[PDB]
Amino acid sequence: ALTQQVNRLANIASSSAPSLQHPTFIASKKCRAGYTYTSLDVRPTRTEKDKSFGQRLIIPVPVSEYPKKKVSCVQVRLNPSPKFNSTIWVSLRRLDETTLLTSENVFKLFTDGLAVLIYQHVPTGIQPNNKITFDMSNVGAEIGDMGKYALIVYSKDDVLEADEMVIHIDIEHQRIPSASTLPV
Amino acid sequence: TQQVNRLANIASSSAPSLQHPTFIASKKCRAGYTYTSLDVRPTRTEKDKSFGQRLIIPVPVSEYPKKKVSCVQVRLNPSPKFNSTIWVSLRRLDETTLLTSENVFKLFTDGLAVLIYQHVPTGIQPNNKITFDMSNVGAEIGDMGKYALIVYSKDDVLEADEMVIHIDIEHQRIPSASTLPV
Amino acid sequence: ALTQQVNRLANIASSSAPSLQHPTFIASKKCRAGYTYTSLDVRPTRTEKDKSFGQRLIIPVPVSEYPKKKVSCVQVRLNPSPKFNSTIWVSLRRLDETTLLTSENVFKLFTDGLAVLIYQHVPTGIQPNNKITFDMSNVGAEIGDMGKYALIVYSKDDVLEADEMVIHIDIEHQRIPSASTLPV
Amino acid sequence: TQQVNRLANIASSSAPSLQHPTFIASKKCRAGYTYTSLDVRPTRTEKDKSFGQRLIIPVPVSEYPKKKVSCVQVRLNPSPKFNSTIWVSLRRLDETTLLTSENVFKLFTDGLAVLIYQHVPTGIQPNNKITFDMSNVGAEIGDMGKYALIVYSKDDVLEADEMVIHIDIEHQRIPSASTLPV
Amino acid sequence: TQQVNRLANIASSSAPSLQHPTFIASKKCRAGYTYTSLDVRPTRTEKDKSFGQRLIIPVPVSEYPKKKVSCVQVRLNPSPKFNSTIWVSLRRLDETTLLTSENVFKLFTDGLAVLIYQHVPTGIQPNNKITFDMSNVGAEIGDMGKYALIVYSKDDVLEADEMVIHIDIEHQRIPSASTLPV
Amino acid sequence: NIASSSAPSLQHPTFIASKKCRAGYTYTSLDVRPTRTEKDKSFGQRLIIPVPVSEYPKKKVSCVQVRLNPSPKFNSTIWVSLRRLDETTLLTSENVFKLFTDGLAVLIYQHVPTGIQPNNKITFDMSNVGAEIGDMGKYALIVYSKDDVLEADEMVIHIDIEHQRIPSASTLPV
Amino acid sequence: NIASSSAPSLQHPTFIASKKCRAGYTYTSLDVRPTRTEKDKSFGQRLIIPVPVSEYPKKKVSCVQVRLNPSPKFNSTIWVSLRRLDETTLLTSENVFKLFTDGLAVLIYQHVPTGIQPNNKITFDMSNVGAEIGDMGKYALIVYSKDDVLEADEMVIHIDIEHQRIPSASTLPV
Amino acid sequence: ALTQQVNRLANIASSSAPSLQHPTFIASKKCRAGYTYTSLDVRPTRTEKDKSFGQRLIIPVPVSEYPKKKVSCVQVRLNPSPKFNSTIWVSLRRLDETTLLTSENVFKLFTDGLAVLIYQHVPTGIQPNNKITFDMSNVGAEIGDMGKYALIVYSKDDVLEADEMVIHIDIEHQRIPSASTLPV
């Protein structure tokens, strides 16, 4: 028997179905299994129209303690509030504080070799495809590295409000060491 | 030959069936399990105002609290007067925590599933059901009370007659208890 | 060969040695392995002399979500501050808020079927045996159950200050389910 | 079992992937080949006016002209200010031949591929890429200069910041040349 | 027969050896690894005041930052003038975070090892060493700088001549680099 | 045939010769017009890895040669080298010397009427220090005009970087 | 015997030594008296392949050395090299420097009272750029008289061209 | 049978016992056997308080004649007189007369990579551990070399007197050639 096409057909048939148990929120999978991940909360600030907002990657206190911990991918789901009226562009890349997101600056990178997600408010429910992910399997990303990165957003039409939405960014990486013996 | 059957199952979910107006499919989550539905006529709820109801198990089940729950579906048969469009979900609760609009959003927007039901003109919204799993969390019948369903009328001042919700509860069959009462 | 005494002799020889790498802090092991634990921080309040202080068990936000999660034991290490001048009695049991630690009330239980740790400040370094543990393997303790419990302390001589010390209470329990697939 | 894999490949191209906003797939045309992209900020171009750029290979490749080219993709990342709608393509050229609107159409309309990019409101146009093959024609790196990309702003007076194009070039890997310069 | 040898090892650690005044044993944490010590004459530090020093790797090692560290022992040879009694340890740092007495305690008291050295009259305190492991955390030579050793003079106004500390660093041997400089 | 395999080697006393460290490695050059930096005044530039590589800070670097093609106008005589560091350290004449006179490399290029002029190439090894692409930024080349104040046009330097070939770039872009 | 086969190699620090790229290859020289080109003024000549070769523009070129026998009168000091291009580009002093200071070769030949004078030979490789005989025309050598204005008689250059042997010339002509 | 632990357990049990036949004088063994040793007498001088006394290694007339004779270790037993009232620090290292034991100088070395013995007068008999030894197996020490070395002492509290004590320093080294034929 040849099972190298069955899987493909099965998974392609799936992912593309408005089955049961779920809002207008797309699907999601997992990177190099044998990995665990960590999510992050990011309520934006009332960012003007044509204005861009961004946040650096600020690892959490318990993981941040293991830089050199490899990252595979990094998904970004965004649960919007009912008050999400605007429509915006969003993505994320490496840095050096040195650079500032002058509207002009942002476009620059937005437009070139790299991924970017658009989230528009549709009055026919709400834009399904609400998450996007990035792969570090190759660039080679250690946990410390994260800080260098940072996600962005650009409010194309409405002056997005802080109450308009909240983003969760999930991070696939190697399991951190599990202690099997009580403290000092 | 498990790949092929898997595709046959998926194709079935995706095809208008001769038993629904627009109400999408709804497979159950357990064998050897029975369920129990609930009726929920929501109080007329203002625009931007939210309505919620605790999980008040009924009289005959409420008595075997040690029984576990797998999942809990929420089908919502709307009345023709259903004009508004709303967001709905449910989670663990602490009474105190109040359904203040602001509070609501808070949770709505984070790790957890939520259903939106809009009144469309070309027939009516399909997926009118949504399910939640308690397997992992480990949920006993008594536990239910802790949880509670919510609703947010995003537009029209949702009317009382605008709709009715049914909450289905998968759990362990209750002992046949073959022995007439008292 | 008979290896049912070797282990015992080896572990008894060990635990009782002022070897290397460690202050006047006793040792520690692990309960039903295949379990993970969780620690808790408890800076006390300036508790008078002859007065007792106590804290209920307030599980954390990520675990508290899985009551019905069995607990094996519960250790209580106490890293004291240099300013730890007093000497105190400490332990922990089940409850019902209904009861209040009237000095008198405390003694009552302190004295009967149950464990209790004394921590005195010695001027010959500091009291080694600084931790104590309790077993729930049998009483059967689920995570929800914890809240019912609560640790206590009684300042026998000095009016213990909040800066005098801080306690960490570690909890052996079953590993919580690990998600292997990114969010909504 | 080559028919089955063929359908699996086709099904894959046709399914939103978790790495694109609306930018359709884009398979490459060669192994043992590497490519090289180019950036093209088009000058603000009037309505009904057309803009074009010759193929100016870069400094480090431009030096191994004997290297052959397979195909050349043209992805175009538009800015949010991208409001216009335009037609674009490219072919062999004779400098003299001038991008006079009229001339343009002439070729546009005949044996050859062309891409149209319109600004839609429901998100944004998908297929933002298009590729051309030089295998047959036989195209050397030097040859590129001969060719040139074009654009026609059918509606808005296409702005400079309205967008940026990237031209990908599949060709033979360049000799590792393991030996530090001069 | 691994149990028996284990007891022989343990018994050895626990027996005055003919090479120490009162300085307890001190086994190393790695093979194929070499270490490097450091000298630390602490500035005279008030009573209740704390002193600290960052990990300033030296000139010849500081150059192979990619080299990993296993553990780091801290032996402290006190002078006869050593009269005070102090607490000492070390951890990751953020410069800013200041050795304000209060800050110190904060960490001292939590998940982490700390050594106390008191001046006794019947000879002198034994265990004068303590070690920390970086295996798990994953520590490169460069990383060291991040960390820093601390001290708290609990009693006497610890004098400069009161003592000297040596910090031993287990890490990967440096390449023989058999090839005279420049 | 380990003898035949190692055989590689070729060079002669002249200003025209240069090998390379490890095969399967590719390199990358850099351009550096200096500044009209004064006499006695030193000029320096950080390692600004370019746009397509700068994306795998984890890739390894073997060597890094620095050839310098001068302009016919180049007249001054200057010392030049490079090392790692923290932006914190500043190229004060005094600071410069400090390092210059260290157990670590350095070239001098002066123009004089004597047969031919010095090699313009010099190279540094990272095969041991262990240098990843990201690491480069930390390093930075320097120069000290011992005599005439060189002008931004008295010369142009090219810095070549041996390192691991970057991703096969398997399939077409975005 | 791959070791014996590769064995070939021989040269020493002096103005008398030169090998060759690939065997089975023959070469062709060229003569180039310059022009009384001014001081600061640059002189250049295109690659005028000769009459019998110029007929197989498809033949491959390996290297191209450029030895230059100067006259005893040669006094000036000059820079010299060569590259490809489009007739369009013009040897303005400024343009010259531009390339001179590129990731691509160059020699300087000055006359001074110091032991012996620089090598007059320099060579360039085409084994990779891939150069066909026709291609030559595109290239062209240059020179810049940094000092004294050299005269058309201050020197004569010979340019040797390694390439594939031309047709066996099997049978007698027309 | 496995006899690689028996010996260890036996010798560890021993050395740590107040058996029979011996004052409050610790024990002692032997270095590379097949070696003989040589002792030295060192009555100190009335060395002030906070003052340090030292003596170079002055090999004896019959051995001193065979420099290049390797030394393994060097023990230093110190039989104190009843009048030993003070308490002192003692050790020993290489030299070059050039250096002088300024109290300050002494500390310097005392505190660093190297052994050091403290001998205090206790009124509960007398400080058992009265000897210390140093190993040259590795540094490689020839008999001539000794002279370079020299032992020291620092009277921490009482102004040690010459009558307060006397030290014997024993030297393990290779047997010197034994003549088996009468003289000239």
Add this chain to the structure above:
Amino acid sequence: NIASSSAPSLQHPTFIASKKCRAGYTYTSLDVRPTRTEKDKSFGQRLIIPVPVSEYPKKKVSCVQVRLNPSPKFNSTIWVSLRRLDETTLLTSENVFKLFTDGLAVLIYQHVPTGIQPNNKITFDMSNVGAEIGDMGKYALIVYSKDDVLEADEMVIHIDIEHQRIPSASTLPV
């Protein structure tokens, strides 16, 4: 494969090249700022073995190179070398010459406007004299400022010492 084993060797006429004696050997460098020693006046420094090595005077030494990184200010021209001796002997100009002109080594480093400057490195062999670490002290390097009086800042010397790797340093300290 004794041929392949011996194969090791690589160097070219320039101020950038240095091998090493025997493997399994490690070395140790030393720093030596001189003194503002007069013109004609010689300066010297004994071999002050450092603190961690100085403890195995019985360890063997192979070679001992002496590279000298000068400061840009270095102007004087000087002779330099080193040998064993008894503190008794004193560096009087006359005494200096005596040895300088012996069957035993020596370098001269002057600064001049001529292409590049001499190698700064020189090395000495002990593989036969038999030198133990302790022995070093007996030796000592010297210098003679033939012209300008060099200043303690006109230069800094590094002396590298090939010798047997010291004790594996098996287990953690005291």
